[PDB]
Amino acid sequence: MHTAEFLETEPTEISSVLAGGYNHPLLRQWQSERQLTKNMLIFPLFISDNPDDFTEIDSLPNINRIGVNRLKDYLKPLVAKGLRSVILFGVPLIPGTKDPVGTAADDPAGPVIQGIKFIREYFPELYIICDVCLCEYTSHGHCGVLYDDGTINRERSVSRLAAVAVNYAKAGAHCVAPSDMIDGRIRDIKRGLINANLAHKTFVLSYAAKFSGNLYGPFRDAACSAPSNGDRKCYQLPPAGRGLARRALERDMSEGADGIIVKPSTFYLDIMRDASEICKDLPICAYHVSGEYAMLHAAAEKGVVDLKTIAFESHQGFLRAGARLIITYLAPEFLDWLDEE
Amino acid sequence: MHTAEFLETEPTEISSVLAGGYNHPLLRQWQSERQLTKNMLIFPLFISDNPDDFTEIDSLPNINRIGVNRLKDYLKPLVAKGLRSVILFGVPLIPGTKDPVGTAADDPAGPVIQGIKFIREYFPELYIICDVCLCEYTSHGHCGVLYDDGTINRERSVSRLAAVAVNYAKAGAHCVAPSDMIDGRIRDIKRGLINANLAHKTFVLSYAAKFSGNLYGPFRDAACSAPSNGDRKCYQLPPAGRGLARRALERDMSEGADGIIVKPSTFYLDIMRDASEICKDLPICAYHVSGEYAMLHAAAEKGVVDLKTIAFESHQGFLRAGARLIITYLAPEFLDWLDEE
Amino acid sequence: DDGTINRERSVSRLAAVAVNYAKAGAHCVAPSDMIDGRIRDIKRGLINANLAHKTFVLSYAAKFSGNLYGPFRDAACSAPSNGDRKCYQLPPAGRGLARRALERDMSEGADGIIVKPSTFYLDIMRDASEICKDLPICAYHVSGEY
Amino acid sequence: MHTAEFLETEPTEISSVLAGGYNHPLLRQWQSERQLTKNMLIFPLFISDNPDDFTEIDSLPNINRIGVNRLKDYLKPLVAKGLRSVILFGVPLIPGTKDPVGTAADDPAGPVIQGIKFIREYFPELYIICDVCLCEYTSHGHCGVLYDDGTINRERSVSRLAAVAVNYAKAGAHCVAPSDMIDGRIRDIKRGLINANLAHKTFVLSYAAKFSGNLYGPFRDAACSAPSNGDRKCYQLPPAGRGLARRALERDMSEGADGIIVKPSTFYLDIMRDASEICKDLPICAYHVSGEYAMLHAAAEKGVVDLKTIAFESHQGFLRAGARLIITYLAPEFLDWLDEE
Numbered sequence A, B, D: 001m002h003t004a005e006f007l008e009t010e011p012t013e014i015s016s017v018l019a020g021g022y023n024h025p026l027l028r029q030w031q032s033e034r035q036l037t038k039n040m041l042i043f044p045l046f047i048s049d050n051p052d053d054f055t056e057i058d059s060l061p062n063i064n065r066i067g068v069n070r071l072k073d074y075l076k077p078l079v080a081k082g083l084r085s086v087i088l089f090g091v092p093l094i095p096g097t098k099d100p101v102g103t104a105a106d107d108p109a110g111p112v113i114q115g116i117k118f119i120r121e122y123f124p125e126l127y128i129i130c131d132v133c134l135c136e137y138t139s140h141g142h143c144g145v146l147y148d149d150g151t152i153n154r155e156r157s158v159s160r161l162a163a164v165a166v167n168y169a170k171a172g173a174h175c176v177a178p179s180d181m182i183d184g185r186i187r188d189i190k191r192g193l194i195n196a197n198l199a200h201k202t203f204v205l206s207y208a209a210k211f212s213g214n215l216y217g218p219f220r221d222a223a224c225s226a227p228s229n230g231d232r233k234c235y236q237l238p239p240a241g242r243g244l245a246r247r248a249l250e251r252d253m254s255e256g257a258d259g260i261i262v263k264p265s266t267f268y269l270d271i272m273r274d275a276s277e278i279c280k281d282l283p284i285c286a287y288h289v290s291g292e293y294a295m296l297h298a299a300a301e302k303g304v305v306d307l308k309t310i311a312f313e314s315h316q317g318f319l320r321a322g323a324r325l326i327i328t329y330l331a332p333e334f335l336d337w338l339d340e341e
Numbered sequence C: 001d002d003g004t005i006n007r008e009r010s011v012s013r014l015a016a017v018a019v020n021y022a023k024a025g026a027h028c029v030a031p032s033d034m035i036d037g038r039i040r041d042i043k044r045g046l047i048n049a050n051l052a053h054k055t056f057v058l059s060y061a062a063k064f065s066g067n068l069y070g071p072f073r074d075a076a077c078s079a080p081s082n083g084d085r086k087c088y089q090l091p092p093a094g095r096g097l098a099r100r101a102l103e104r105d106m107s108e109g110a111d112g113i114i115v116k117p118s119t120f121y122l123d124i125m126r127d128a129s130e131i132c133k134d135l136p137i138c139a140y141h142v143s144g145e146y
């Protein structure tokens, strides 16, 4: 009948034997080129012009639109658990705010700058990052200033963005993160900070490789940033554009970025590895975007994976691929989990 | 009052201007270093020893355990839509099959070899890949033969695996895909095919970088491959082990792999990029595993993403990262979609 | 008999000691002898003893001779008898020899490497970070440095 | 009972055998990629505006603050033992010297320029290097000119530094060594030497990688350069900043450095190796700083190490790491020791 056949084998070659390096729990930690720590985390905040706001963004599980009067009580526990950094997005809902050139983006009475002043006053040790763009402030929902045919106007757009970024830094932001993907905007932002005598204390964290695709969903609600007039494929990178992403990384580093962000993260880990070579002397940041985070939550409550397990697997994923910073909506969860681990 | 500030800007530098390369639909195709085609797809089949089986694997949406009498009617439409390759997994349910050394893995009456004979007879132009391992055939559910303390026995395990692989090739498999991750098994499998005069017609497709983690869920059901006695962390690579993965890629190529598989895929795209350098002269394959595929389905029916959109985004992801082959449960969907695209 | 090291018996003896520690329950062996080829034999011994799959070989692949070992010799009563350890400890200027020793021990089965001493040899750690980029690199802060 | 076990061994592999290259005293010299010679040494001098000064700097064993009338008798034996180079630091103690913009840094009556004129007259074959900075000449003790909030003013600072450096070269310095670490100062210094027709005979030796930390102690006394208003962490590099150091090396070479200094030395040898690649076509200099040198002396008189032995070990360390020049307070000792060795 049928029995187990065993082939005649040669002595073991040393070259074959990898197992001595990962047979114990502590070893699978020795095997990581970087470990996750609390100060690596950056938590997004969506700031309302309604100062009493604390509204659920139904598309973005466990995250709300908060106003300045409710921020202190929100951030206090977070800071106590070790949160070191926030990335501000403003969501101004008061009618008549939005205009073709994003005027309210750097309105001193606006949610972002008020947010910056609040946080500097009440949490002076908190590192403040501001998203720099016009899409939450424009009428058409696009990231820049447009010509009449609805295409982006590079020159006015970047001239406007430089202004907004410097104005955030003037207000007290420690770092500006331009998310517009419009050609050459980092040069102009850097030049504006230099002219304003702020380049020596403002970190330019460029979304240098921000891709177009199906993972932005939950955010647009969180920011009411739904476009008007077509899609953002003419400046967001196309998912297959590795070459364009490599050139964008090189470009933004040349134009003054102190750091770079790759967005989305899990679906673009190879681009993070690319970045780890091109921008080896710069901090690389992963942005765990709303669709990725929401995907994890859905699969979890469907029983496909465990939330905390897949959270650690994916965020360890970022560090493996070369990131040393992480923008994530699971930051509250990790400030808890990292005490145990 | 507050008006839009525009900073004084310099003339545009040519170095800044990337947009001329991706302003049109056809360009975002010109920008891909590889495009998805039908012959890149590899579809898994789970073959039952019940020849009348066509049972839903509830954890793996739209995929079933099929028996040989139902295979012809299943594969016929698939081949007609262009399917060129299958990867066989056997799921023997007849009691008393499973034994400590995986005896039934290469049982000529078993689902795999019967599957191989059926497919060679009825679909002679179909390229047949067989998963090579012992976990579906053992009592303890582990991928190899174990010592008494329950650790893996490298020597007997690899001696057994070499045998199974050669026996599949003797039966008519065109390609063997060892998924065991046990040190040096590719050398012995290659040596066995050479001794059996089959090395010249058998492709060795090594799971050279197969990682441990939370994404295997739905499969274990599909294959009834749930472990017994602890976890597979002592041979599956640990999620952070980039160094170990790089060494495993080099090793399996040195030991005779004609191609390599990275598994899982989306959560490990950086490893695919790593592989694209180390194994630049070899075909690289992505395995879209049951948990990843099930995650896409869940998020989709939750409204987070669109199924076909995120399917193309992720599978384009594999090609961008350097894969030129794709094992995926969405192969039926893509044989349809690629006609349009 | 002339007091030089005997490579063959030395390494045959070391392989034995290392495997015996692993047999006793050590998770990792760290050979600090710097005698040519000892990692191959230790690896081969663990393989023959069926322990290579659970024993990490952490080689002192770049251990240098010099003035920083002082306090240890007391701690271990390891003061030499018959000359110095310059014929196997690497000479402080031997960057080339250190690079070759790193490559060699990785080829012979090290799962990890140690550079010793540490602060005075940081450039060798950087060297190691390239040669042994896929392996854990360990610094030993030795008794004289501390 | 317990006897010595010897395992069965294989024949020796040639690949294992390194020992044939270092079994003799002469070989451990053949093994060095560079040997220490006398002309590699650079000796610091701290020049007093009291011309009769010869005051012990208690924190810096065996080194004094000397005035011009005592310099000839000090330098004469040194030159006779082979000293080829000095690096001048001025320590002006006459009250009312120090002012917010470092006015006295290039005072023709000041210790540095007087020192330059003395040495050119009395030791015309001596190569003169001058430290270029403002910290010994300012009221606040900082290395540059500051805005009102106490941060550094890049533009005036570098405009001032360029002036000081050119003025030293005008006085007769052969080399300028800017130690300020303020962004872009090498460009302006180079441009100033070019405009003054001195770029063709003035070596720019940039402290391109000068790190912040705990090793500067003994110097601050030697130079009375103790800060006022916080710390120098906003321009000195942070100890972990390898990326910033690599970029600073590239930058200063691009801006005109003919050579670079890494400071401190022993605790930063990996940065010297980094520099040996980035600046492979430039002389690399190690600065053995006051805290490192004082640490050697303390450990020595505590019996932990032997002074001459650890001196040769560390300074050989610099050459191994890629330096070919050494600024050190042990230069008197080595001019003696190198005759024997």
Ligand SMILES: *C(C[NH3+])CCC(=O)O
Residues within 6 Å of the ligand: A131, A179, A215, A216, A217, A218, A219, A220, A288, A289, A290, A291
């Ligand atoms: C990106 C804004 N710049 C964030 C999108 C998201 O969903 O997280």
Ligand SMILES: *C(C[NH3+])CCC(=O)O
Residues within 6 Å of the ligand: B131, B179, B215, B216, B217, B218, B219, B220, B288, B289, B290, B291
């Ligand atoms: C891997 C079997 N070798 C497949 C796991 C899955 O879920 O697809």
Ligand SMILES: *C(C[NH3+])CCC(=O)O
Residues within 6 Å of the ligand: C032, C068, C069, C070, C071, C072, C073, C141, C142, C143, C144
């Ligand atoms: C090395 C023993 N292998 C340790 C020496 C010391 O002083 O730490």
Ligand SMILES: *C(C[NH3+])CCC(=O)O
Residues within 6 Å of the ligand: D131, D179, D215, D216, D217, D218, D219, D220, D288, D289, D290, D291
């Ligand atoms: C550096 C002055 N640029 C010297 C500091 C020391 O202590 O040697």
Ligand SMILES: [Zn+2]
Residues within 6 Å of the ligand: A133, A134, A135, A136, A142, A143, A179, A180
């Ligand atoms: Zn935008």
Ligand SMILES: [Zn+2]
Residues within 6 Å of the ligand: B133, B134, B135, B136, B142, B143, B179, B180
């Ligand atoms: Zn298996």
Ligand SMILES: [Zn+2]
Residues within 6 Å of the ligand: D133, D134, D135, D136, D142, D143, D179, D180
């Ligand atoms: Zn200074």
